[PDB]
Design a protein around this ligand. Structure first.
Ligand SMILES: Nc1ncnc2c1ncn2[C@@H]1O[C@H](COP(=O)(O)OP(=O)(O)OP(=O)(O)O)[C@@H](O)[C@H]1O
Ligand SMILES: Nc1ncnc2c1ncn2[C@@H]1O[C@H](COP(=O)(O)OP(=O)(O)O)[C@@H](O)[C@H]1O
Ligand SMILES: [Mg+2]
Lengths: 518, 106
């Protein structure tokens, strides 16, 4: 044969990715497809060196098996790694020599024309770094260097620490090409769950009520091992329920078992989606007047502008208003309204006790991650706390300000897009630090400033009504009211705590005392 | 077929330490952990053995064993809250009341 461009691998039983194939197989075909003698005449070197790196559990071993099988090579030999490297040097000499001799004997016997041997290694980072490390690394390098001239060497290795491996191992002609395996993928997670549940359905024991789509949606960042453990826990809890009970003939696994196993037994690795919106928007968005609609309209218009256009891939916004006016929730709602693939919120609640350098690193990491997807939206709230500000002196951090000022006007890689939303409550400070000159536009969030709006909001929230509402309206009308939305909830809660008949008095007294003048 | 054999490794943190450096000549500590890891899980498959490892501080435990496939379902045993406390005090006082050695005042 001259070509094997068959790509049933994704549907063969392993998801993986559908991009590596092109590079891997184009290089393999270039190396080996052509007749050997012309290659000898041209004096080109066959590719020998592969390193699949990343966090464990992503399914690297299966990829290494598939590439070995699909490639027309001999059966694979593999070692955990430190095993070969015994404490005593000299073991790392005979032991290393025998592995290479295993293929040398066949290569000599069969001459130049011979098959490819695929030797798999794991945890190379452990050995690469007390004088045993250098000698072991040199002994390994000796064969691939060219002194031993082995032309049949497929060395697919694995590791988790790219910074604790000699770069000489990747010097041209040593490892050359590299790749890493990422998250289990939402659609890939769906596919793996489908494969496992199809193996289950092979006997139709699984109940029809169970669905794959919703389950895959719920579970976030569960490596294949984690999903298999979840399946095992589900089966175990179903068995427990059965034993605590003809029932055997009626054994069926229900969704509730899956939910209980997910909640109790299996610990996630990365799951956050159902925390952000639940926490930051805790009481929902309640319309109180006309000003609430303008902000949302402008947000949607800006989202549309950033979605489809060129010559302006980067757009920035700034929400400003008096304190206790509910700026974080509205920005979160604007972020949720669109359906961008990537959405993240950077707030100071998670960086207590940090120094400025750590905050810079965290912001940089979030932005770097946000640069990858096709288009994304980011939110920064309490800009005046990120750069800790004290009206005495005044004092603040220069490094964070410089990093933010640079990041706000740095275009993403070619062809991508990005949206940034920021929130603050002190515009004059930013105006003085020449930071308001970077944001493209601004949006003003006002407070309640009329008795009619106060009555409407109170009625929509409920609680006070009938004669209480009539008295409140009579008292408030013909006056000036200036109160933030977030303060109204606290005041109403406080006033509701008194005796049933002595409630309106406390609320009116509190409202009159506070609110001051605008 | 057959039954199961249960091996209880008390003070398991003594022999299974981190295989990082150990800064010591000879690799007895590393060799022991590697041999046990190979035996528990390896090319051959054993399905009639269960190991219960009890430790006082999980921090000083090698990473490999806690990984899935070697040792799973890890539990924590905390302090009794209110009812276990009464049960304990009854268990440890049953004898004296059996022989009438506790005054009615208590
Ligand atoms: N229409 C609304 N707009 C804003 N917030 C609302 C609205 N309706 C209800 N809320 C509630 O108001 C609270 C808004 O809190 P938020 O953190 O946004 O306040 P803030 O004044 O921006 O805060 P801070 O001054 O601490 O930066 C949330 O409980 C949200 O549920
Ligand atoms: N893409 C995938 N498709 C199906 N199963 C997978 C996939 N990725 C991981 N798994 C499951 O997760 C486990 C991966 O273990 P393995 O890759 O050997 O460990 P490591 O990733 O540390 O080398 C396997 O048991 C496999 O069933
Ligand atoms: Mg806020």
């Amino acid at each position: 044969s001259i070509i094997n461009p068959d790509w049933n691998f994704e549907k063969m039983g392993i998801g993986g990715l559908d991009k590596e194939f092109s590079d891997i197989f184009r290089r393999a075909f270039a190396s080996r497809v052509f007749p050997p003698e012309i290659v000898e005449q041209m004096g080109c070197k066959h590719v020998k060196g592969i390193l699949l790196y990343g966090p464990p559990g992503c399914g690297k071993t299966l990829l290494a098996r598939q590439i070995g099988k699909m490639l027309n090579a001999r059966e694979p030999k593999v070692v955990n790694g430190p095993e070969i490297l015994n404490k005593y040097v000299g073991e790392s000499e005979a032991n290393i020599r025998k592995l290479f001799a295993d293929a040398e004997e066949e290569q000599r016997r069969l001459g130049a024309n011979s098959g490819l041997h695929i030797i798999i290694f794991d945890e190379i980072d452990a050995i690469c770094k007390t004088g045993v490390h250098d000698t072991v690394v040199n002994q390994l390098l000796s064969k691939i260097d060219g002194v031993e001239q082995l032309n049949n060497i497929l060395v697919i290795g694995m590791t988790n620490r790219p910074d604790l491996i000699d770069e000489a191992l990747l010097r041209p002609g040593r490892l050359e090409v590299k790749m890493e395996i990422g998250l289990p993928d939402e659609k890939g997670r769906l596919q793996i769950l489908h494969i496992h549940t199809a193996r289950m359905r092979g006997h139709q024991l699984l109940s029809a009520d169970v669905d794959i789509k919703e389950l895959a949606v719920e579970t976030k960042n569960f490596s294949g091992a984690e999903l298999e453990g979840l399946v095992r826990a589900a089966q175990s809890t179903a068995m427990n329920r059965h034993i605590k009970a003809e029932k055997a003939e009626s054994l069926q696994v229900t969704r509730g078992d899956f939910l209980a196993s997910l909640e109790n037994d299996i610990k996630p690795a990365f799951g956050t989606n159902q925390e952000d919106y639940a926490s930051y928007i805790m009481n929902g968005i309640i319309k109180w007047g006309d000003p609430v609609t303008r902000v949302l309209d402008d947000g949607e218009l800006l989202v549309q502008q950033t979605k489809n256009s060129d010559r302006t891939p980067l757009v920035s916004v700034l929400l400003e208003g008096p304190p206790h006016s509910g700026k974080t929730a509205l920005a979160a709602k604007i972020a949720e309204e669109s359906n961008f693939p990537f959405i993240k919120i950077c707030s100071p609640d998670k960086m207590i006790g940090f120094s400025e350098t750590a905050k810079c690193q965290a912001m940089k990491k979030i932005f770097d991650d946000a640069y990858k997807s096709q288009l994304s939206c980011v939110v920064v709230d309490d800009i005046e706390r990120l750069l800790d500000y004290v009206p005495i002196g005044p004092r603040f951090s220069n490094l964070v300000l410089q990093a933010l000022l640079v990041l706000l006007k740095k275009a993403p890689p070619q062809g991508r897009k990005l949206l940034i939303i920021g929130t603050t409550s002190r515009k004059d400070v930013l105006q003085e630090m020449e930071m308001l000159n970077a944001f493209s536009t601004t949006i003003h969030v006002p407070n309640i400033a009329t008795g009619e709006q106060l009555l409407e909001a109170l009625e929509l929230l409920g609680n006070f009504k009938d004669k209480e509402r009539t008295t409140i309206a009579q008292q408030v009308k013909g006056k000036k009211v200036w109160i933030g939305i977030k303060k109204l909830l606290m005041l109403i809660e406080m006033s509701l705590q008194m005796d049933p008949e002595y409630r309106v008095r406390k609320f009116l007294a509190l409202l009159r005392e506070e609110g001051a003048s605008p | 077929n057959s039954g199961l054999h249960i091996i209880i490794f008390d003070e398991i943190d003594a022999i299974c330490k981190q295989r990082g450096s150990m800064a010591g000549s000879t690799g007895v500590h590393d060799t022991v952990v590697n041999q046990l890891l190979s035996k528990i899980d390896g090319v051959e498959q054993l399905n009639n053995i269960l190991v219960i490892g009890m430790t006082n501080r999980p921090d000083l435990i090698d990473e490999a064993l806690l990984r899935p496939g070697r040792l799973e379902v890890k539990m924590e045993i905390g302090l009794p809250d209110e009812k276990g406390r009464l049960q304990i005090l009854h268990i440890h006082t049953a004898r004296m009341r059996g022989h009438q050695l506790l005054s009615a005042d208590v």
